[PDB]
Symmetry: none
Subunit: 277 residues, 2 copies
């Protein structure tokens, strides 16, 4: 029931628009504080948007846009319980008009699985006061640009170290966070999985929040494809620190195609198993 309408233009904007935003959060009363900020950020671009108006027009409640409640079976269960069908159900609810998602998240490692289940085919705005940092609407396809070679790298440096060409097990290191995991990741890969192959990605010089973060995704995708061009890899394990937006977009781009075992630092799930679980 629509009863929170105040301005007459609000009804016109809510009934004669092409895209209806649905801000979604990934939180483990803090949701109310997080959803208030998320409702304000979309209000910057859509002053006609309101959570009460959204629940009146389409029934998308506040709990309907948030999944709450050694990363393990608990992590994969929270992944498959609501996240797997959330986007499909919400897009089914607003069936005529297109959907412009607004995504924020909390857990870095779980954000990779959330993005992989989320897909590369969603017009999204990934926000990181919350500031939008990933713009994949309006331009989106550029997220999968792997054309940037190793020589013309501007933001980050990639180094590939291979010690067992016969063994097709490569480690994935992305040093784009707070604490450098390079030594710990090397010890873990050389001690537990006995993997001597690592694909480290480090910064060339945390980030500029105001600026668009697409070149980071383009550079990591290009480095991964360049590494996979000449050699064969059966399995990839990540060992990284990253912002929510960066890993979320990496999961969006790489997706479920590559055989990847995402681990969390303080395996858990499999990127190819998101479509299987």
């Amino acid at each position: 029931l629509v009863h929170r309408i105040k301005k007459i233009e609000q009804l016109d904007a809510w009934l004669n628009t092409e895209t209806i935003p649905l801000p979604v959060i990934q939180y483990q009363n803090e949701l109310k504080r997080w959803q208030k900020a998320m409702e304000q950020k979309v209000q910057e671009k859509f002053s006609w948007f309101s959570y009460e108006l959204l629940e009146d027009f389409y029934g998308i409640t506040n709990s309907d846009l948030a999944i709450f409640g050694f990363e393990a079976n608990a992590w994969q269960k929270l992944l498959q319980e609501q996240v797997k069908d959330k986007f499909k159900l919400l897009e089914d609810k607003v069936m005529p008009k297109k959907v412009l998602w607004f995504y924020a998240g909390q857990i870095s490692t779980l954000q990779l699985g959330i993005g992989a289940l989320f897909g590369f085919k969603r017009a999204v705005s990934i926000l990181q006061t919350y500031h939008e940092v990933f713009i994949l609407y309006g331009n989106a396809r550029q997220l999968k640009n792997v054309s940037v070679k190793k020589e013309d790298y501007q933001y980050i440096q990639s180094e590939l170290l291979i010690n067992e060409p016969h063994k097709n097990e490569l480690g994935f290191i992305i040093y784009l966070g707070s604490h450098n995991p390079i030594g710990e990741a090397k010890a873990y890969c050389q001690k537990q999985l006995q993997i001597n192959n690592f694909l480290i990605i480090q910064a060339r010089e945390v980030m500029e929040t105001s600026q668009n973060w697409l070149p980071y995704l383009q550079e990591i995708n290009s480095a991964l494809n360049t590494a996979r061009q000449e050699y064969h890899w059966e399995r990839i394990h990540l060992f990284q620190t990253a912002p929510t937006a960066l890993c979320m977009a990496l999961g969006i781009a790489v997706g479920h195609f590559l055989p990847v075992d995402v681990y969390h630092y303080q395996c858990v799930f499999s990127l190819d198993k998101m479509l299987n679980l």
Copy 2:
């Protein structure tokens, strides 16, 4: 049985036209996402033929959304016989039956698909004798774009030579001239298959001759507004030039290519070539490649 039509302009436009769009799509998953995909495709077709509608299609030729969808429930099993059964029970006669459904009026297929490897078989069973608009979703605005227009001779053009290449770069590695078999590798997507397919060929097919095709400048992103017909022209010219000075008894196809490009390549090559297509399955144990079908065994 016209009952879901309100205006008369759509009625008269449907009655007195020559081309009737039959937008056929392929999906593997849930029916709700199939309905959403069909709705987006219907919007794209109405952008060009405003009188089009699924309800009008059903009221005019008695044809539902099922006939326009190559639909399968869940993930396709990673078995060659399963893919062959899908190609034969569904795709082998689908286009023939849809063509026969509307006999006096020409059909204009507005095609998009989901599984890239399947699109080669769809194009092979499709044939160059059908004028077709091949689409590709641009994800900035969540809308299709007509990247191939065949409504078709320039589809099967050859006159472009290697020195005049502008879009793709092609190389031919012939290390064993005695062996009359090579692997066709295409990389015009965002996940490089060169290493994995080369390892598969050299460890499971014992083939050391390759035809590698990539993009020249912008690999992984192709302008969905611009026509992709030159891309396929370059690819087909490279393929035929590789088959001019050499005889290839059998070809092996691995590709990370757009769905639109895959279907365009399938319709250009057709079944007049000895190629086995190998599909990469994400949720599969190593080896993740498998000869799902052969291009020369369709008929």
